[PDB]
Design a protein around this nucleic acid. Structure first.
Ligand SMILES: [Mg+2]
Ligand SMILES: [Mg+2]
Ligand SMILES: [Mg+2]
Ligand SMILES: [Mg+2]
Ligand SMILES: [Mg+2]
Ligand SMILES: [Mg+2]
Ligand SMILES: [Mg+2]
Ligand SMILES: [Mg+2]
Ligand SMILES: [Mg+2]
Ligand SMILES: [Mg+2]
Ligand SMILES: [Mg+2]
Ligand SMILES: [Mg+2]
Ligand SMILES: [Mg+2]
Ligand SMILES: [Mg+2]
Ligand SMILES: [Mg+2]
Ligand SMILES: [Mg+2]
Ligand SMILES: [Mg+2]
Ligand SMILES: [Mg+2]
Ligand SMILES: [Mg+2]
Ligand SMILES: [Mg+2]
Ligand SMILES: [Mg+2]
Ligand SMILES: [Mg+2]
Ligand SMILES: [Mg+2]
Ligand SMILES: [Mg+2]
Ligand SMILES: [Mg+2]
Ligand SMILES: [Mg+2]
Ligand SMILES: [Mg+2]
Ligand SMILES: [Mg+2]
Ligand SMILES: [Mg+2]
Ligand SMILES: [Mg+2]
Ligand SMILES: [Mg+2]
Ligand SMILES: [Mg+2]
Ligand SMILES: [Mg+2]
Ligand SMILES: [Mg+2]
Ligand SMILES: [Mg+2]
Ligand SMILES: [Mg+2]
Ligand SMILES: [Mg+2]
Ligand SMILES: [Mg+2]
Ligand SMILES: [Mg+2]
Ligand SMILES: [Mg+2]
Ligand SMILES: [Mg+2]
Ligand SMILES: [Mg+2]
Ligand SMILES: [Mg+2]
Ligand SMILES: [Mg+2]
Ligand SMILES: [Mg+2]
Ligand SMILES: [Zn+2]
Lengths: 75, 159, 104
RNA sequence: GUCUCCGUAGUGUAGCGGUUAUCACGUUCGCCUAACACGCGAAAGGUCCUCGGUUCGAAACCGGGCGGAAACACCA
RNA sequence: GCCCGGAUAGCUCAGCUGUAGAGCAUCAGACUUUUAAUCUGAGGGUCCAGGGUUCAAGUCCCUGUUCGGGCGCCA
RNA sequence: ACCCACCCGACCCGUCUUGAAACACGGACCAAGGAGUCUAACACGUGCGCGAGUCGGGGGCUCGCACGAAAGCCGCCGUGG
RNA sequence: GGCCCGUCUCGCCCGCCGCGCCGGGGAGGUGGAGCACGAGCGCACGUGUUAGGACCCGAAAGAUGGUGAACUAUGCCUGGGC
RNA sequence: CGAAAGACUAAUCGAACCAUCUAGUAGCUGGUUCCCUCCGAAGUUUCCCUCAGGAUAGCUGGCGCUCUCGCACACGCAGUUUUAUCCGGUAAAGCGAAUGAUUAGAGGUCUUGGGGCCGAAACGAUCUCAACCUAUUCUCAAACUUUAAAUGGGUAAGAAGCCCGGCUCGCUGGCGUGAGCCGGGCGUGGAAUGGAGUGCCUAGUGGGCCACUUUUGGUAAGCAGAACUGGCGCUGCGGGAUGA
RNA sequence: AAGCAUCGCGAAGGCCCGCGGCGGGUGUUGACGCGAUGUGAUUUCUGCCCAGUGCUCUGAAUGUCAAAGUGAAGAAAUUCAAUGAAGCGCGGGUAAACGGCGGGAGUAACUAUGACUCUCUUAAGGUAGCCAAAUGCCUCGUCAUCUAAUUAGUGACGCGCAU
RNA sequence: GUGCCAGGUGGGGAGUUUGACUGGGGCGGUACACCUGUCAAACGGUAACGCAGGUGUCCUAAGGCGAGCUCAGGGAGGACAGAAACCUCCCGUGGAGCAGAAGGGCAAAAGCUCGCUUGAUCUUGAUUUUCAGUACGAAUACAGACCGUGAAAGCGGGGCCUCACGAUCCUUCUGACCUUUUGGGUUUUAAGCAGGAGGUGUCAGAAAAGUUACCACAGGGAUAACUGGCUUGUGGCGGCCAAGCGUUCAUAGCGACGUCGCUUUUUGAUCCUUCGAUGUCGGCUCUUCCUAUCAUUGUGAAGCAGAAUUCACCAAGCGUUGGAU
RNA sequence: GUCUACGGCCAUACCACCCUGAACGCGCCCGAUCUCGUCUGAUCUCGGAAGCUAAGCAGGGUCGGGCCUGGUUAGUACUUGGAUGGGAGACCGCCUGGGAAUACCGGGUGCUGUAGGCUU
RNA sequence: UCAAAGUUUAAG
């Protein structure tokens, strides 16, 4: 009682009933499987972003004032 | 039934082309892959450490990791019904920059040039591409000489 | 195969590399008062015949050899199991084979 | 056809990868005998079935050739 | 796996920590007209392998490799 | 809707089967009977009550139970889950 | 990004009735059916999956306890027949 | 019990009958009860003392939810194509290119031979056949190939994008990198089509067969076995007299 | 089935029943008996093989071999030791126990066969007989006979797939 | 002797088992776990008891570095020395070698020869390959230790790459001033925790021999033994071509080397139909049909004088017997 | 014009033979005390500067081989999709689109980056 | 106070 051994006959049709959907690309993918020494470092970089905030805020305020002076000169 | 061996059926794939065996020329090794660089994998027989699997030969993908002398690279692989974005670590020698993207970057750069200019002018320019249209009305001048008559030629058996 | 009787390799307890004494491993005697054996004996007791299975279908013809790496530096002497691939010949320190010589 | 084994001086056989290839008979040459036989003393003789391989090295280990010989070929 | 034999010169076997025994076989001397048979001598042991104990080991010790009779069998 | 005529169409159902009108099996005919149930355990869905709670059992107090072996209540209201 | 529990690596300080092979923390990885202003409990209905006779009908068997030698098998007792 | 046939033991014997355990177990036969409406499969996956069965994926249904806007004011997705750009070693072709096969003559004491004929013998003369070589020549290859298609497989075609300004790092470093953060500045970025996304429960199925083209075994087969698509199976209707 | 031939047993026995008993059957028996096998009247014979598998005989001369008992160290559970029954092994017997019972070469003044000789081999190598039988594949064997004609029958032959 | 333990012996008796695939089964194979090339239709993926082969190992270096070299083969030379010993020059894209099958890869190497070595060590995760996108095995990139080597850049956590391997349970060994060993404490013991090893080749892993003709049950046309279908290799019958035979002359009658057909009175293939059964060989009896014609009717041919004859045409009307085994 | 050092792409750069090379370079070259290493100062290492372009190296040459690039081969071979097209089959023709490879014949025969010379 | 030792033109 020998059988049919293998096939792929109806399979393509089966696959395409529900698409063959491309893998859902999100923005912001994970950092799983990234070279550890990188991740250590970038973690540390994130950890101390809050240090040197006041300087950054002051710089942004100076930039905004320069923009306002430029728009007043234009108008 | 077939063997599941890793390198089965890569007699021709991983085989350096005719009169290009030997030393791997160094440019290969000394060009930089950042994150998010689109990259087309293509196995190479010489360098056997860090070879990608035969399925990803030909496939292109983006870089997500950069170790010392290898580069993690997300590629799409189909599997019967479902496509799986999956991440492989290939040693540099089996990898090139995919020029696919560069023609697009050139076109964006051209649009930005043509958007900065032609704004102060006022004349808005065609930015989108457009498919090769029907080839327009035009005259053909049979200058003096008439067209050449072409009889089909009579059969004869050569061999 | 041949392996040498000394081996400068890692010693967990010290932390460094260090010379170890090598020797091939063997099974110990089988307690009699391990939980298993005790469990088997008082199952196997009474009537019923044999209760657990008996393996009568040997396939392979060799064991994975295991070295027992003992650290040489005293105030340590930390032993350690170190497996090697299968082989139906093994020895320790059986000469150095000699390149470029006469065979007779 | 399957699986198995064996092909070694003229004959029948030994042979554990490194041999002058073992033993017996046969053969030739002496002697002994009137001669012969027996007997005694010497000698000569192997394509190790065939080809290719592995091996530093194959008569053997491995593959195929040409031969030879056992067992199986059942239920209708 | 557990107990124990044996491994000694071509062969079969003795050997009580201080030229390795016997017999056969091997090769030169007698005997033979010669041969065989038999008598005399000679040559020939990695004492299975390695380490130790020991002043000294063929033996004691341990450990292997065998090699056989019995026991034995939970991935 | 009863009968009859004519033209056209039209093979016997059930079933296993890649394939049944089958030279595959079951079936003369009619009546009545005749096969996805209940319990427990889980899961997800849905509806209702209450909500950091929720809960009801088991027990107890209220009746001779006509309807009740219900209904109601309980610092037991929470031992406990 | 953070926190908890396991686990490793590295490190420097604290605590006291009992100063100790005592106790407590830190930084960085990594395992967890975790936390990160709660969603459960009870009841009812449905579907599915099981355990039960378990959709219905179906063996050849297996076990326990009993009834039979009025047939037939063989022995014995006592009669009959050729 | 047997003068032995597995004979006989109440029409029952290679283990009697009766009742119970018992509704014994069955991956196997058979059957399985009203109507309409909507959706609608599979015979392939890996694992299995698995191959008449299960498991797991797939294909189905059901329940939904989150958004979208024909309410003059759309984003994303596709069994297409286009424009870029990679991949390929099949058809073909080739063998005066490698590998292997293979015909013929021209040329060559290459080598050397074995056989000759004329030579004592002599690369002497003359032939010859061996292998080798110098140009040529005949025909070949699923497990050869310098070449090399058609059809085919990836990517890409923008707001998650560009372009400025500045901060963080224990990484990296002559200075710089590279990454990560804040803060502003800029909009339709090929064709054609269409509303998308997402999560739970989930049955049946896991004997398939047929045709175009490709294709392996076989002399072949209404044979066995794969690929691709479409069928039949689940499906009537016109035609092919008849008919999956 | 008679006849033949083996085997066990002298009774606290052989053989056998039974769940058990100072139980029972043979047995109201005693080797001219009871029990267990084979062969199958008479006649005439009954070859060789004890290597294999069985059965049996002997047993400190002795490898292993259990529980108990004996010693040992240990705080004790314990472990280690020596000790050591039958049975295996070791050594005899047994085939009217199960059974088994050969292969090359060369050789005789025509050829042919081969008395004869050479080997290689087993535990022996199929003896007496008997045969294409109820046993022989090839096979409708060959020769004779029986028939006009015989894959049949009988008598011979023997090389006998596989007496 | 009885009672209770121990070892032996025990198809007298009991219970049970006696794989799978498979052009029916059995026998044979292993296509049952792996790997190369092909099949395979130029991504990947793909079947058969398709083809050609390999695997259950091997290596203290044949692993790791660094240095230096250059291999196969050939030519021309040189005492003994010849086709082969050793030395020397030249050519040499690899035609060698790299443990093994095959494919790829490899030349101031991945080959050979030296020098020093243990990266074949200790430890987290990520990924790839089979994939269900679970395991195992095998691999890839990192990261943290401790080392090796090199002047150094670097390279190295086994073998240039593609195969060489194994769960739960149990056992054993190793590891930490570790946990538990339960009313508390000390010590043995045992149990845990984490990593090796002892194996399941039917290789995701039962512990397992026969027979049944005395047989039984559930099923199966998923599967054999008939017929009938397809097929026609094989069997049978028939052409074409014409080298030959036929004293002579290819073809009266034949016909090699080749080639094209038909037939289903052979046998194979095959497995569609039937396993809730289509009565399984022959003979006898009886009818009918076919022609590929033995005889008979009518004819063409001859190597037909006659007689006898073969060869061919129309043709199946009528016949085609009695016996021995 | 050109070279040296380190190079990128790796024959338009290779191979064979022939010719020519100012200056600086590159070399050959001459030595072995030290360093270093050899059977051997041949190579390797080191100290030099008397010769010379002979050789390497560069540039050129050859109706050169090779390689690179066009044509031709050829709209041929092959091929996507199509037909109740043909043909007994084997196979072939058409439609719809895509389209190769030898032989044969031409042309070409290194480009170029960084740093430093020379031709002042 | 007993090892083994077989054979001999047809050619007068
Ligand atoms: Mg199937
Ligand atoms: Mg017991
Ligand atoms: Mg029907
Ligand atoms: Mg029919
Ligand atoms: Mg039926
Ligand atoms: Mg009926
Ligand atoms: Mg009813
Ligand atoms: Mg609910
Ligand atoms: Mg469920
Ligand atoms: Mg149920
Ligand atoms: Mg029943
Ligand atoms: Mg039973
Ligand atoms: Mg019988
Ligand atoms: Mg029922
Ligand atoms: Mg089944
Ligand atoms: Mg069925
Ligand atoms: Mg291919
Ligand atoms: Mg071709
Ligand atoms: Mg079929
Ligand atoms: Mg169906
Ligand atoms: Mg007898
Ligand atoms: Mg006898
Ligand atoms: Mg005996
Ligand atoms: Mg006889
Ligand atoms: Mg008769
Ligand atoms: Mg007779
Ligand atoms: Mg039994
Ligand atoms: Mg089967
Ligand atoms: Mg394809
Ligand atoms: Mg090197
Ligand atoms: Mg490291
Ligand atoms: Mg190596
Ligand atoms: Mg206590
Ligand atoms: Mg019988
Ligand atoms: Mg039978
Ligand atoms: Mg039946
Ligand atoms: Mg059938
Ligand atoms: Mg038939
Ligand atoms: Mg003629
Ligand atoms: Mg009938
Ligand atoms: Mg006719
Ligand atoms: Mg010099
Ligand atoms: Mg020069
Ligand atoms: Mg010159
Ligand atoms: Mg040229
Ligand atoms: Zn240590």
């Amino acid at each position: 009682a020998k059988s049919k051994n293998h096939t792929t006959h109806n399979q393509s049709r089966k696959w395409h009933r529900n698409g063959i959907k491309k893998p859902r690309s999100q923005r912001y993918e994970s950092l799983k499987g990234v070279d550890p020494k990188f991740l250590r470092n970038m973690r540390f970089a994130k950890k101390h972003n809050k240090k040197g905030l006041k300087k950054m805020q002051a710089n942004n305020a100076k930039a905004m004032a320069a923009r306002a002076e430029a728009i007043k000169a234009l108008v | 039934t077939n063997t599941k061996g890793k390198r089965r059926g890569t007699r021709y794939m991983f085989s350096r082309p005719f009169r290009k065996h030997g030393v791997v020329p160094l440019a290969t090794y000394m060009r930089i892959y950042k994150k998010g660089d689109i990259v087309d994998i293509k196995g190479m027989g010489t360098v056997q450490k860090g070879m990608p699997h035969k399925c990803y030969h030909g496939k292109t993908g983006r870089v997500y990791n950069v170790t010392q002398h290898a580069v993690g690279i997300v590629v799409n692989k189909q599997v019967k019904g479902k496509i799986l974005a999956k991440r492989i670590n290939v040693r540099i020698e089996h990898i090139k920059h995919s020029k696919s993207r560069d023609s697009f970057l050139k076109r964006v750069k051209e649009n930005d040039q043509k958007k900065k200019e032609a704004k102060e002018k006022g004349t808005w320019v065609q930015l989108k591409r457009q498919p090769a249209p029907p080839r327009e009305a035009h005259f053909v001048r049979t200058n003096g000489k008439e067209p050449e008559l072409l009889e089909p030629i009579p059969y004869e058996f050569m061999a | 195969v041949n392996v040498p009787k000394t081996r400068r390799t890692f010693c967990k307890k010290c932390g460094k590399h260090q010379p170890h004494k090598v020797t091939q491993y063997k099974k110990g005697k089988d307690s009699l008062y391990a939980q298993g054996k005790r469990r088997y004996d008082r199952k196997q007791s009474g009537y019923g015949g044999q209760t657990k299975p008996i393996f009568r279908k040997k396939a392979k013809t060799t064991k994975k050899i295991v070295l027992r790496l003992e650290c040489v530096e005293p105030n340590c002497r930390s032993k350690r199991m170190l497996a090697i691939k299968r082989c139906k010949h093994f020895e320790l320190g059986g000469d150095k084979k000699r390149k470029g010589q006469v065979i007779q």
